[PDB]
Design a protein around this ligand. Structure first.
Ligand SMILES: Cc1cc2nc3c(=O)[nH]c(=O)nc-3n(C[C@H](O)[C@H](O)[C@H](O)COP(=O)(O)OP(=O)(O)OC[C@H]3O[C@@H](n4cnc5c(N)ncnc54)[C@H](O)[C@@H]3O)c2cc1C
Ligand code: SF4
Ligand code: SF4
Ligand code: SF4
Ligand code: SF4
Ligand code: SF4
Ligand code: SF4
Ligand code: FES
Lengths: 1178, 67, 118
């Protein structure tokens, strides 16, 4: 080898020869875009995103294909490269039909993940929904109570029946969160920076919330006695109760924000003080100066500003109303003042607006409600004079006006009508025509002509350096969520400025669908919206009690289940979106004809969408090169190309095995794997690495969860990075709602729920009664093979405590390997498949285990020779040099005789290492050698190294023994790259056998039939469902105790049913088929709070066994060491494990080579039944 | 019918690199490539079905609709 | 357990331990601890050992296998230790021990239990 010297982005690198530029840049922390590149597949070159400029070459070179040479200067971000990538991304977007974020998210000024928390509500994850809200909205309940909800105006469900009640759902989850201890987001470590926020309103509190999250020291100066702003001294109590506001502000203060109330800028505190002792200052003073009437006599007593009147009312200060009140204005202030006056005892309240009803800035619902309460309205009327008699207002003279022409807004301009004047009798006049920023609070700042503070757009920075502003002080009076969005943006900008580099807010570019029409939703089911509970007008017009009430949990879930899921499910993991955000792409210039070919499918696991396919070919290349099924392919040619299954059939009708590799390799959400949850929702999940337990290959995986629900499973890029149907999709049983979480005991002949202590006591007493009455060896323990090593060891210990040697499993087959070699284990490891010379795959190795099929495909591609022995067709027969279809073990006897005849057996060494050779020769002396047996013997003899892969769950023990004999005769045992590997049927078969569970189904059934066994303790097995003939056998047991995840058909006939938890809720140790020890991590906490090991430890402590996880692990390690099996990659290197230390050659009579058996494990049987019902393969 | 393709499949057997010729002869015989005929070819020659559909739809000379 | 559940007893003993009492279990007088040790390092010693030796039958053959003391049998049952019961059980006595043993044997699967009182 040679070390090549390259230069990538002005950084000298010493890379290795034969590497692509992509690999070198990846290993040297240089980012190169790529969409059609995978490490396990040959280069394709379609997308053209990885183009880099190489000095000395005129054309841009693909980094996924070009190999680094010596003295190579590579520029991966030159303007030529940037333009090429931008053009490629624009071309890809021109044919893209998707929705990066739903219209509900885009319509919200704070850009709250509306679809996210709506879908989380529909799944029952209320705390996760609240946490998602608090990522952009610190006040879920308060804002949900008071918000015009523009998101519902943009909701796509408007095209079907009625927009989703997003505000109501947010209020519901906010109420749930506030009912218990509130949710505080994680706080970054203290940065030692102090920020001074002036104002305790939504903008200031939002800035404090999003700056304390960054670890800064936050102090909020508030002039009013209590924080809240116009959410407290504006909005009345019947619309927003102040207890909720107090609770939210207390939650904010719990984050470390110091709110100094009664501190006023310019009166108690000067701006110089803040600028001197604080790094940054954010002003959120708001518009706190109501506009004067603007007509003569506006200063007469009896005329009061709207916001001042509402502040006096909220503060419970004495106000001077009367029988007759008129409110001048049309905003929220006018309507709130009118309704407050109605509730404060005014007999007549009349609202005067200069425009008409249609141009009323107030919401229609508020106006209608006030009309129900008794507020009268006069439109097209504006004030011109205040008739005051003795210094107190007597009436007000208005000039009627009419809509003449257009205005600055462009809709319509009202102009006065000459000769039209009306006198309205007035005891109180509330001028609520709008509010302006108080000039005193904003001294020393440059003011916009409108009176608001002038700030630089995108940075929220005032004229003074280090002083920021936002909210109503900058934009004028708006809705509260706009102020919250301003506060959040200003907080992000202030954090950037504090870090040193000030960066203006950059709005991302989203792919959105604007061609949608209601005709696209003509097939969706119409569901009624959630009813709104509104208090009676007569009863509510007298008190300040809240009008609307929060929805119930059932109504909230039913409402959130109405969502159409408009946003892309791959938003958080789409790379096309990331790349189009990284480059200034202008898609409109190239937009044109776009295909619409998505048709819904019935596949329960994988959903394909042709409209988001960038035609990278990754799914086809991974189904053909790695999996080897070749169920996908290109269809048509040119602009009409589409990825389709075999003959365009549904994925279930093809040979697809539902591995999900196509969904895992797709970059742009065209192919996705459906989440195992009630409602699909695109969420940012957390991934934990664990081990699949559905067969002995022990594939590692990353389980991605959000809350207590599992949302996805991804393969680990260890080797071929592959998962089969089980590991990828059968993790759905963790979220299953049919799981039992509390024990059941038999009361009055029926199973009913109880406590764990009582159930375990009953179990112990029943077992003790059986042992006492019927003596020793009368209790059978039928444990599943998916339990950890510690649980199996504990079950063996408990069986010793019960004086019973019947410790076995219904999934266990009769052993042959321990009578030949000494140990029932695989001699070699999965790492020697690649380096062996010949592979003998016996049974349905590829069909049962798809990952092993991919491993064999890779090994044969690397140079190995494959010989498949089976009875029917196999996917491995394509690349097999020799294929044998057999049904009897006479084939192996004939092979042994052929080996002996050609003198391919070194009799001296074999007789030295293997006793029982004369009998084997005598046994094979009479069989007839066939052509197939002779060919197989020639192949075996001519191979330097040989590995025999045996599917233990579909191969009889006679075949295994005969193959062991063949390996021993040709001296292919105990050496590197030679041996026998058993692919066990379940996750921890090897560990269960090593711990002491070594009784097969037949022995236990026989013992029950003779009447020797009178009770059974079944741990997560389903004898009744899997086998009908066992139903009578279970009738012979006096007592049956079942420990299962689900209430199976065999748990319904038990006396005690104990609940188990999934394998993602239990930490421990499992053993791979080759003997490798792997760790089961804790992805989720146990749903009932008790793990399987905890339950079994409680039961054992009831018998006087003092154990824990560490002690059991130590005992397991000692047990493995005593058999010379611990951390040994190759077995029998020194000598065999038989007492003679020799091979006891397998001599027996002929028998069927392969067997078909059921699965007794509960979860695996359930998932296999599910796949059979859905007509899927695996 | 499917027996009409029996001679062609017998002539181009032993190698899975002659699928385009088989498709052309099927196109000449049936005047089109029915999905049952493509299934029969896929079963007889041993080439994967997706490959057959791809090679068939690649060219404009092969059309999968009855005359 | 059907007359006094052990959870209640555990809760009461935990309440007692919450007062500052240190209960050293598995410590036996004369085997693990000598009386001199207690008399030397403690001001006062209070012995509450109780009557923990069941009376033998007092008839020839009382040592034959299949004859077990009442309190020892009840202790084995409570500790969930394996006892060698049978279809036929006779309890000799008339106290609380005899009745508890008879009812435990009935609940432990004995077909018929007969109590013999003089
Ligand atoms: C009557 C009324 C009804 C409304 N109804 C709704 C509704 O139904 N829905 C909706 O979405 N929005 C509504 N709004 C709008 C919403 O209340 C405001 O737009 C929002 O609160 C703006 O908050 P802010 O932080 O910009 O300023 P504000 O909340 O107006 O004030 C912020 C804080 O600044 C403080 N402050 C002022 N001067 C100083 C100073 N010199 N020193 C220190 N602190 C100072 C004040 O004490 C106040 O606490 C309503 C507003 C009003 C007036
Ligand atoms: S596939 Fe990616 S780019 Fe396309 S809509 Fe979905 S998230 Fe956006
Ligand atoms: S804050 Fe208002 S606009 Fe935003 S999602 Fe909630 S109701 Fe809609
Ligand atoms: S249907 Fe759901 S995702 Fe679509 S706009 Fe409405 S709330 Fe958002
Ligand atoms: S899920 Fe089916 S189509 Fe996709 S890669 Fe696996 S076998 Fe091929
Ligand atoms: S569907 Fe297949 S070809 Fe299309 S983007 Fe996904 S992986 Fe690439
Ligand atoms: S091959 Fe076995 S270990 Fe791997 S994913 Fe499938 S069931 Fe799980
Ligand atoms: S061309 Fe190299 S990643 Fe696409």
């Amino acid at each position: 080898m040679r070390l090549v010297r390259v230069n990538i982005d002005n950084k000298e690198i010493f890379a290795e020869e034969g590497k692509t530029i992509l690999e070198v840049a990846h290993e040297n922390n240089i980012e190169i875009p790529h969409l059609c590149y995978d490490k396990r597949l040959k280069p394709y070159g379609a997308c053209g995103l990885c183009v880099v400029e190489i000095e000395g070459s005129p054309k841009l070179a693909r980094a996924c294909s070009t190999y680094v040479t010596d003295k190579m200067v590579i520029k991966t971000d030159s303007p030529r490269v940037r333009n090429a990538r931008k053009m490629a991304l624009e071309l890809l977007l021109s044919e893209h039909r998707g929705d990066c974020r739903p219209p509900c998210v885009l319509a919200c000024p704070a850009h709250t993940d509306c679809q996210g928390y709506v879908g989380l509500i529909a799944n029952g994850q209320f705390r996760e929904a609240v946490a998602l809200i608090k990522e952009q909205l610190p006040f879920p309940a308060s804002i949900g109570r008071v918000c015009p909800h523009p998101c519902e105006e943009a909701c796509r469900r408007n095209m079907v029946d009625q927009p989703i009640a997003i505000a109501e759902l947010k209020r519901f989850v906010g109420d749930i969160d506030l009912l218990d201890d509130g949710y505080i987001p994680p706080i970054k470590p203290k940065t030692g920076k102090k920020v001074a926020i002036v104002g305790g309103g939504p903008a200031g509190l939002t800035c404090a919330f999003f700056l304390a999250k960054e670890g800064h020291d936050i102090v909020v100066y508030e002039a009013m006695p209590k924080a809240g702003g116009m959410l407290r001294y504006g909005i009345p109590e019947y619309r927003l109760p102040k207890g909720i506001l107090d609770k939210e502000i207390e939650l904010i203060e719990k984050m470390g924000v110091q709110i100094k109330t009664n501190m006023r800028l310019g009166v108690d505190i000067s701006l110089e003080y803040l600028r001197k002792n604080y790094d940054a200052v954010f002003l959120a003073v708001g518009a706190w100066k109501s506009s004067t009437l603007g007509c003569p006599g506006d200063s007469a007593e009896g005329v009061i500003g709207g916001i001042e009147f509402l502040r006096k009312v909220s503060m419970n200060q004495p106000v001077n109303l009367g029988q007759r009140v008129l409110v001048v204005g049309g905003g929220n202030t006018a309507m709130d003042a009118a309704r407050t006056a109605i509730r404060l005892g005014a007999k007549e309240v009349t609202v005067l607006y200069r425009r008409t009803r249609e141009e009323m800035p107030a919401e229609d619902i508020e106006v209608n409600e006030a009309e129900e309460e008794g507020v009268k309205f006069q439109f097209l009327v504006a004030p011109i004079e205040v008739i005051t008699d003795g210094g107190r207002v007597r009436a007000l003279k208005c000039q009627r006006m009419r809509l003449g022409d257009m205005d600055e807004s462009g809709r319509r301009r009202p102009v006065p009508i000459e000769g039209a004047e009306v006198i309205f009798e007035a005891d109180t006049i509330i001028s609520a025509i709008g509010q302006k920023v108080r000039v005193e609070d904003v001294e020393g700042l440059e003011l916009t002509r409108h009176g608001t503070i002038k700030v630089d757009e995108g940075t929220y920075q005032t004229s003074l350096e280090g002083v920021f502003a936002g909210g109503d002080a900058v934009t004028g009076p708006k809705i509260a969520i706009e102020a919250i969005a301003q506060g959040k943006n200003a907080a992000r900008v202030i954090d950037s400025y504090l870090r040193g580099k000030l960066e203006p807010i950059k709005e991302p570019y989203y792919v959105k669908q604007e061609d949608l029409t209601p005709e696209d939703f003509k097939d969706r089911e119409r569901k009624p919206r959630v009813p709104l509970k509104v208090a009676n007008a007569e009863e509510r017009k007298n008190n300040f009690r809240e009008i609307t009430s929060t929805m119930t949990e059932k109504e909230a879930i039913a409402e959130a289940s109405r969502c159409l899921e408009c946003g892309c499910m791959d938003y958080f993991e789409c790379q096309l979106y990331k790349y189009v955000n990284q480059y200034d792409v202008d898609p409109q210039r190239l937009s044109g004809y776009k295909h619409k070919r998505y048709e819904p499918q019935k596949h329960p696991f994988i959903e394909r969408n042709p409209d988001k396919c960038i035609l990278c070919g990754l799914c086809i290349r991974v189904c053909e090169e790695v999996v080897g099924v070749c169920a996908l392919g290109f269809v048509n040619r040119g602009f009409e190309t589409i990825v389709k299954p075999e003959f365009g059939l549904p994925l279930e009708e093809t040979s697809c095995i539902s591995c999900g590799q196509c969904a895992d390799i797709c970059p742009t959400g065209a192919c996705i794997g459906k989440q195992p949850v009630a409602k699909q929702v695109p969420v940012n999940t957390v991934a934990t690495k664990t081990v699949c337990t559905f067969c002995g290959m022990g594939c590692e995986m990353l389980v991605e969860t959000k809350g207590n629900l599992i949302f996805d499973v991804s393969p680990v890029q260890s080797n071929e990075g592959m998962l089969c149907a089980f590991g990828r999709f059968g993790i759905k049983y963790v979220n299953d709602k049919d799981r039992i979480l509390a024990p059941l005991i038999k009361v009055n002949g029926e199973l009913s729920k109880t406590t764990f202590d009582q159930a375990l006591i009953e179990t112990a007493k029943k077992l003790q009664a059986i042992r006492a009455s019927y003596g020793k060896d009368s209790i059978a323990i039928i444990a599943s093979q998916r339990l950890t090593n510690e649980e199996a060891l504990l079950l063996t210990k408990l069986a010793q405590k019960l004086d019973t040697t019947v410790i076995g499993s219904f999934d266990l087959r009769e052993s042959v390997l321990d009578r030949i070699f000494g140990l029932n284990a695989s001699t070699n490891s999965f790492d020697e498949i690649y380096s062996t010379d010949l592979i003998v795959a016996v049974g349905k190795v590829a069909e049962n285990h798809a990952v092993m099929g991919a491993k064999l495909k890779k090994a044969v591609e690397l140079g190995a020779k494959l010989v498949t022995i089976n009875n029917g067709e196999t996917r491995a027969d394509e690349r097999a040099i020799a294929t044998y279809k057999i049904d009897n073990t006479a084939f192996f006897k004939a092979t042994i005789k052929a080996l002996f005849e050609m003198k391919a057996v070194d009799e001296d060494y074999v007789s030295k290492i293997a006793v029982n050779l004369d009998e084997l020769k005598d046994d094979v002396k009479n069989v007839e050698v066939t052509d197939e047996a002779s060919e197989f013997a020639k192949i075996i003899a001519g191979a330097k190294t040989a590995m025999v892969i045996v599917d233990e769950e579909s191969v009889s023990d006679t075949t295994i023994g005969q193959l062991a004999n063949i390996l021993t005769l040709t001296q292919k045992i105990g050496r590197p790259r030679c041996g026998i590997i058993k692919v066990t049927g379940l996750g921890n078969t090897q560990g269960a056998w090593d711990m002491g569970i070594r009784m097969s189904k037949e022995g236990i059934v026989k013992l029950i039939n003779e009447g020797k066994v009178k009770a059974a303790f079944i741990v997560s097995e389903d004898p009744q469902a899997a086998d009908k003939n066992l139903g009578e056998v279970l009738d012979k047991l006096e007592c049956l105790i079942v420990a299962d995840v689900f209430l199976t058909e065999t748990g319904k006939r038990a006396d005690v049913v104990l609940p188990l938890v999934s394998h993602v809720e239990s930490t421990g140790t499992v053993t791979r088929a080759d003997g490798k020890i792997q760790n089961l991590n804790l992805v989720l906490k146990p749903k009932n709070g008790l793990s399987n090991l905890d339950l079994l430890l409680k039961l054992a402590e009831l018998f006087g066994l003092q154990y824990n996880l560490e002690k059991l692990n130590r005992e397991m390690v000692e047990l493995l060491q005593n058999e010379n099996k611990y951390n040994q990659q190759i077995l029998y290197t020194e000598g065999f494990a038989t007492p003679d230390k020799t091979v006891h050659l397998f001599v027996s009579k002929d028998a069927p080579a392969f067997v078909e058996k059921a699965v007794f494990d509960t979860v695996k049987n359930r998932f296999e039944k599910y796949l059979q019902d859905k007509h899927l393969k695996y | 019918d499917l027996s009409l393709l029996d001679p062609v499949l017998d002539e181009y057997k032993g190698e899975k690199s002659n699928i385009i010729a088989i498709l052309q002869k099927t196109q000449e015989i049936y005047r089109f490539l029915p999905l049952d005929a493509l299934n029969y070819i896929s079963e007889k020659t041993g080439v994967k079905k997706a490959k057959i559909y791809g090679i068939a739809t690649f060219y404009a000379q092969f059309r999968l609709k009855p005359v």
